[PDB]
Amino acid sequence: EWSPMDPEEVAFEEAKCMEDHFGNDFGLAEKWMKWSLAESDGKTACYVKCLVEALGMYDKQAFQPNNIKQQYEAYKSDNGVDQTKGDAIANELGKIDAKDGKCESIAKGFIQVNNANKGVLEKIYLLDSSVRDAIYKKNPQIKPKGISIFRFCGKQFYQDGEAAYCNVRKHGFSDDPKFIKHSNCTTRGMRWMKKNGEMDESAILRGLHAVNENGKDDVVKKSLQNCKAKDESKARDYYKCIYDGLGEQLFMKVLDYIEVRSENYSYRLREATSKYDANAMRSKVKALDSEAKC
Ligand SMILES: Nc1ncnc2c1ncn2[C@@H]1O[C@H](COP(=O)(O)OP(=O)(O)O)[C@@H](O)[C@H]1O
Ligand SMILES: [Zn+2]
Ligand SMILES: [Zn+2]
């Protein structure tokens, strides 16, 4: 089921749709980040479809006005949109064609509504820079941009420089009791574990393909299938199952790149940081060790 999303959740989902559809056209990716959605750019049609489904705007045959209303209500004290305009676009979007559910059908009505209320959707869905940043400042429990998911989780459970923490940095795993909470936080933050507590196999494979690995899909599937996990330590156990299946070297190569990208989800969509560079990763991992005082 869908529920209101915080600015980190929307930014995560937006970046995932952009990566899946931009097709190495960075100028088109730049337009999407600015929400310059124009039917006339080839790939934009199916990108909008990805975006509205991921944001809970589109479900069955047409849009869901009560989802958009729920998203507006969840952050009305911060989105800067009047109650009149809020309920307006919810109903205004829920009067769309849709019906069949094609890319060009949903994108046409979305681009049409977006241009009639420019900037309002970015505010309601917490992608507007001022709305996003104010929410982050008032909600320290949400991971903001500029800090990695592992560092954000690590600061909750470990003292900087403590031995168990530096083992996590060095080997990606720890036997100490705090690692159950930490790996639950990071596996969920990486979306390897979904909100409902179940593993997302495709999300793990995204991390492998990001570092240009290709033959290990059926290896990950077996690790998950044969894993004996108890609900008290569910994420930790699946995390260790993936660790053992891939081995430390490959597992950490995947995790290090996930960590670097988690500071700003648009990382791979800028051209200079669009390609995995194993040589550049060494100094990035070193800087993250230093940040943790390890
Ligand atoms: N919590 C977050 N964690 C990681 N990346 C985030 C988060 N929130 C937003 N982002 C990313 O931040 C990017 C914006 O970075 P930057 O362009 O320098 O900031 P701004 O919006 O001010 O331009 C967005 O495209 C989004 O992907
Ligand atoms: Zn090691
Ligand atoms: Zn096969």
Residue numbers in the entry: 2 to 295
Q: What does the original paper state about this entry?
A:
Taken all together, we demonstrated that CxD7L1 inhibits platelet aggregation by sequestering ADP, which is released from platelet dense granules upon platelet activation promoting a stable platelet response.
To further characterize the mechanism of the adenine nucleoside/nucleotide D7 binding, we solved the crystal structure of CxD7L1 in complex with ADP. A crystal of CxD7L1 that belonged to I212121 space group and diffracted to 1.97 Å resolution was used to collect a data set. The structure revealed that the ligand-binding site is located between the N-terminal and C-terminal domains. The residues involved in binding ADP or stabilizing the binding pocket are S130, R133, Y137, K144, K146, N265, Y266, S263, S267, and R271. The hydrogen bonds between the adenine ring and residues Y137, K144, and Y266 determine the specificity for adenine and the lack of binding to other nucleotides with other nitrogenous bases (5′-GTP and 5′-TTP). R133 binds to the oxygen of the beta phosphate of ADP which may explain the similar binding affinities for both ATP and ADP while affinity for AMP is lower as it lacks the beta phosphate. The amino acids that constitute the ADP binding pocket in CxD7L1 create a strongly negative surface, showing an inverted pattern of amino acid charges that completely change the nature of the binding pockets. Moreover, the structure of the complex CxD7L1-ADP was solved, showing a different binding mechanism for a D7 with the binding pocket located between the N-terminal and C-terminal domains whereas most D7s bind ligands within one of these two respective domains.
